[PDB]
Structure formats: structure tokens, C-alpha cells
């Protein structure tokens, strides 16, 4: 029914102010409460605050004096302004409406935007080094597992495909790990040994912030 | 400042099992709301005002409690119930949330398929050498990886990462990466990735020697 959409930057520098927009389509912000919630790495959620139908605000005491929420009723948008952000303000930020009912209907519902992941760090754009992972040997069994190593990149995210999507069921791409300011990820793909190395298998690694186009068929060695 | 203590923190339930999640408050709250979050989706109201089913939630769920003790209950576990649940209170500002219950699917045990990979020739142009170990499609999730250099454990310089429960087969995967200085990688020839899990006690070891292959 209703629609909320988070708009803003993905990466911010420490000490800088974090700025986000929540745009509301499907309903007016002239009625109800409109809030910002955030999900930390480790998955705890924190209620950040609200801006009312009348423009009144409420801010969680935990956000000390750093958070302010504004709105534009003749554009149906409300904004978050979070000052002096340290690395620990890194999270996915969601705008949302408290549980209510509406129209007619019997049931309580609520409305959440999709969320925006925000990275707080002073790193610079660094394409990843993409390496081939091929076994150093093998006689038997029916499957063979090969993969790719995407190391030292910034920022998130990275994307990995195998043979342009034509390999899927045996794929595992692992969450990225932050190490010494740089991200590292790996991906694996298991195929029948009568397909490799007989028939080529390639990892398609793309990194959006540094326009990287890496393809690397995994060859024996 | 109402503190919402939730339990258990993580758990696996078979299809059809009865499941109970508790949320205990620091102080009395008038009601407890419950939210559901599946991988890829935002949190969605699940239970409203302690016991009322929210739009789109099936009748196998229910809630109860009052004062400082509340619970949420699935009569019969379905695979689609797999997710993270959060209890929430709004009777006192600020509105607070519980730490969450990660609810997983229980399935048949499966030993990890283990595969080891040596550094690539491409990475040997730099000053680092990384060995990667893949421990995939296993169950349950608890697993330990040990990295042996010449049959001798090495701790740290390791980078471990887990996938979330596979959506098709309910298993888990885990990658381990040992990044060494290139010169230290060439002083040792035996590289072993050892997995200790639940199949048996000792198991799954994959190795490669630096002296072999090129």
C-alpha cells in the first residue's frame, strides 16, 4: 500500500554529518509519526527518533545532541541529520512508521523503507585484487570445488557471478570482512569434475565504486 | 531505558516443532510488540499489542504476557518462519528493542565438504600469500577451523566468514583465509586446513604441499 524510500550517500567520513532523506509515497506525513531506526552490525536495532504530523520531534537520549529530524510537507519528505559520525555509526538506516491500522480493515500493520547501508570510514576507493582459486591436485569424486578471492577493496559492495549466471546452484559467495581498512571476500563454485577442467568456468567480479570489470576463468596449476 | 532481554538468542527448530521466545523487561511496560525480519527484508510487524496478529501473519503465531514477562509462540514451525524476531516496547520513551532471536531451520547433520587452495601466482607479485579453505554445506552451524603450517598451528592472520543458512538445503558454509608474508609462505611447504565439527571427533583435514605442483 504505502511506500517509504531511503535516499542518501553510502559512505561518509568520520566527523562529517550524515544526511539522509525519507520520501513517503502512498500517504501524507501530515498525519502520524515518522521515524528513523538503525540496525548495527551484530543485528541490534536502535530507535533513533521521530518527527510528528505537527513537526514536533523526539530524539533518543542515546544520540546525545547529534541527531536532528526535519521535514518538507509539500514534497512529503522527512530528513535525518546526524552530526560527528564515528566508524561506529556504520549501519543500515531505515525510515518507518509505527504500528497503526487504517482505511477500514481489522489488522494492525506498519511501513518500513528497504533501508540504506551506511559506511563510516576514512578509506579511499580501492579496486579489489581478484585471484583464481584452483586446486593444487585432485583421482576421485564426482564434484570439484573452485573459487575466487576478492581482496583489499573499498568500499562495499562487490558482486560475484559464475559463468555470467549460468552456474548458480553450486555457488556460495561469503560476506565481506573488514581487515586493516580494506574489505575481502571469496566465492566458491562446485561443478562436476567431467565439466572442469574440460569446460571453462569463470568468475565475474564487479566493484561498483571503482568501475571494475574482472573476469578470470579458473585454470589448473 | 527499559531494557529488553530476549531469549534464546539463536535456535534451530524442526518443521512442525513448537517454539517459544521470551522477552523480559527492566520495568513494567503496558504491552509488547513483536517484529519479524527475514534476510533481504526490513523488519515487519508480527504481533501487535502483546497478542494481536498483524496483517499478513499466519494463525500459528501468538503472543502473551504482561508486566515484565512476555512471549511469542509458533504452534508448528514452518520453514518460512526462519528469521530474526525482535520484541519491542513503546510504553516508555525511548522505545526499545530486544537483542533478537535468530530462528533457524533444524535439518539432518552433514559433515563439511572441505577444500584447500594455495596462493595464486598472481598474488605472489605482492608481498603477501593467502591460503583459502572452504568448508561448505555443513550442519550444524557451530564449527572450528585450524590452520596448520608444517603440522603446527598458526593463530591469527586468519580471516573467517560464514554464510547464512542456505535457503534451498538449510546448510551453512564457511570460508577461512590465512594471509602470510610471501617470504614466510616459502619457508614452509605443508599447508593444512583442519575442520573439527560433529560428524566424528578428529576429522576433515585437507592439505597441499608447496613442493608439489606448478
Q: Solved how? A: X-ray
Distance CA B109, CA B122 (A): 38
The answer to whether A28 and A46 are in contact (CB under 8 A) is no
For chain B, give every domain's residue range: 1-107, 108-209
Distance CA B184, CA B182 (A): 5
The answer to whether B154 and B146 are in contact (CB under 8 A) is no
DSSP label at A176? P
Answer whether B86 sits within 8 Å of A45, measured CB to CB: yes
Q: What is the resolution of this structure in A?
A: 2.1
Q: What domains appear along chain A, each with residue ranges and CATH number? A: 1-122 (2.60.40.10), 123-219 (2.60.40.10)
C-alpha cell at B81: 518462519
Give the contacts of A172 (CB within 8 A, at least 6 positions apart). Answer: A187, A188, A189, B134, B136, B163, B173
Half-sphere exposure of B143 (CA within 13 A, CB side): 31
Give the contacts of B86 (CB within 8 A, at least 6 positions apart). Answer: A45, B6, B34, B35, B36, B37, B43, B97, B98, B100, B101
Could you tell me how many helices (H) and strands (E) chain A has, helices first? 0, 19
C-alpha cell at A2: 504505502
Can you name the residues that pair with B22 across neighbouring β-strands?
B7, B71
Distance CA B104, CA B41 (A): 16
Same fold, B1-107 and B108-209: yes
Distance CA B71, CA B94 (A): 21
- Residue owning grid cell 543458512: B165
- Residue owning grid cell 513483536: B34
Give ∠ CA B104-B63-A46 in degrees, rounded to 5.
Answer: 65
C-alpha cell at A138: 585432485
Q: State how beta strands A129-133 and A143-153 pair.
A: antiparallel
Cβ under 8 Å to A: B residues 98-117:
99-100, 102, 113, 115-117
Give the contacts of A162 (CB within 8 A, at least 6 positions apart). Answer: A168, A171, A187, A189, A201, A202, A203, A204
Can you name the residues that pair with B139 across neighbouring β-strands?
B110
C-alpha cell at A13: 567520513
Distance CA A198, CA A138 (A): 14
Distance CA A16, CA A8 (A): 14
Distance CA A158, CA A176 (A): 8
CATH superfamily of B1-107: Immunoglobulins (2.60.40.10)
Answer whether A131 sits within 8 Å of B120, measured CB to CB: yes
The answer to whether A57 and A81 are in contact (CB under 8 A) is no
The answer to whether B129 and B181 are in contact (CB under 8 A) is yes
C-alpha cell at B43: 523488519
The answer to whether B90 and A98 are in contact (CB under 8 A) is yes
Q: Which class in CATH covers the domain with range B108-209?
A: mainly beta
Answer whether A174 sits within 8 Å of B52, measured CB to CB: no
Answer whether B97 sits within 8 Å of A134, measured CB to CB: no
Cβ under 8 Å to A: B residues 50-89:
52-56, 84, 86
Give ∠ CA B90-B40-A50 in degrees, rounded to 5.
Answer: 30
State the Cα torsion A50-A55-A61-A63 to the nearest 10°.
70
End-to-end CA distance of chain B: 62
DSSP label at B182? H
Q: What is the DSSP string of B61-99?
A: EEEEEETTEEEEEESS--GGG-EEEEEEE-SSSSPEE--
Amino acid at each position: 500500500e504505502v511506500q517509504l524510500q531511503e535516499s542518501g550517500p553510502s559512505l561518509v567520513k568520520p566527523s562529517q554529518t550524515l544526511s539522509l532523506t525519507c520520501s513517503v509515497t502512498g500517504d501524507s506525513i501530515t498525519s502520524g509519526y515518522w521515524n528513523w531506526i538503525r540496525k548495527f552490525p551484530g543485528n541490534k536495532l536502535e530507535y533513533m527518533g521521530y518527527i510528528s504530523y505537527s513537526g514536533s520531534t523526539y530524539y533518543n537520549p542515546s544520540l546525545k545532541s547529534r541527531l536532528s529530524i526535519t521535514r518538507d510537507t509539500s514534497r512529503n519528505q522527512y530528513y535525518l541529520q546526524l552530526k560527528s559520525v564515528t566508524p561506529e555509526d556504520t549501519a543500515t538506516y531505515y525510515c518507518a512508521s509505527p504500528p497503526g491500522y487504517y482505511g477500514s480493515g481489522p489488522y494492525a500493520m506498519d511501513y518500513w523503507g528497504q533501508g540504506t547501508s551506511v559506511t563510516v570510514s576514512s578509506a579511499k576507493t580501492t579496486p579489489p585484487s581478484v585471484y583464481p582459486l584452483a586446486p593444487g591436485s585432485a583421482q576421485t569424486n564426482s564434484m570439484v570445488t573452485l573459487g575466487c578471492l576478492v581482496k583489499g577493496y573499498f568500499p562495499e559492495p562487490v558482486t560475484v557471478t559464475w559463468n555470467s549466471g549460468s552456474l548458480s546452484s553450486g555457488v556460495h559467495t561469503f560476506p565481506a570482512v573488514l581487515q586493516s581498512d580494506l574489505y575481502t571476500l571469496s566465492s566458491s563454485v562446485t561443478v562436476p569434475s567431467s565439466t572442469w577442467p574440460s569446460e571453462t568456468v569463470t568468475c565475474n567480479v564487479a566493484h561498483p565504486a571503482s568501475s571494475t570489470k574482472v573476469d578470470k576463468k579458473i585454470s589448473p596449476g | 531505558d527499559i531494557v529488553l532481554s530476549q531469549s534464546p538468542a539463536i535456535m534451530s527448530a524442526s518443521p512442525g516443532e513448537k517454539v517459544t521466545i521470551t522477552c523480559s523487561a527492566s520495568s513494567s511496560v503496558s504491552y509488547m510488540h513483536w517484529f519479524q525480519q527475514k534476510p533481504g527484508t526490513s523488519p515487519k510487524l508480527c504481533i501487535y499489542t502483546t497478542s494481536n496478529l498483524a496483517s499478513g501473519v499466519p494463525a500459528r503465531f501468538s503472543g502473551s504476557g504482561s508486566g515484565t514477562s512476555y512471549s511469542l509462540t509458533i504452534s508448528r514451525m514452518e520453514a518460512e518462519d526462519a528469521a530474526t524476531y525482535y520484541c519491542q516496547q513503546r510504553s516508555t520513551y525511548p522505545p526499545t528493542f530486544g537483542s533478537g532471536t535468530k530462528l533457524e531451520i533444524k535439518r539432518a547433520d552433514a559433515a563439511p565438504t572441505v577444500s584447500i587452495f594455495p596462493p595464486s601466482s598472481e598474488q605472489l607479485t605482492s608481498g603477501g600469500a593467502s591460503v583459502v579453505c572452504f568448508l561448505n554445506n555443513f550442519y550444524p552451524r557451530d564449527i572450528n577451523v585450524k590452520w596448520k603450517i608444517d603440522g603446527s598451528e598458526r593463530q591469527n592472520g586468519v580471516l573467517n566468514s560464514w554464510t547464512d543458512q542456505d535457503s534451498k538445503d538449510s546448510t551453512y558454509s564457511m570460508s577461512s583465509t590465512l594471509t602470510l608474508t610471501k617470504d614466510e609462505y616459502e619457508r614452509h611447504n605443508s599447508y593444512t586446513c583442519e575442520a573439527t565439527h560433529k560428524t566424528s571427533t578428529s576429522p576433515i583435514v585437507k592439505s597441499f604441499n608447496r613442493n608439489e605442483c606448478a
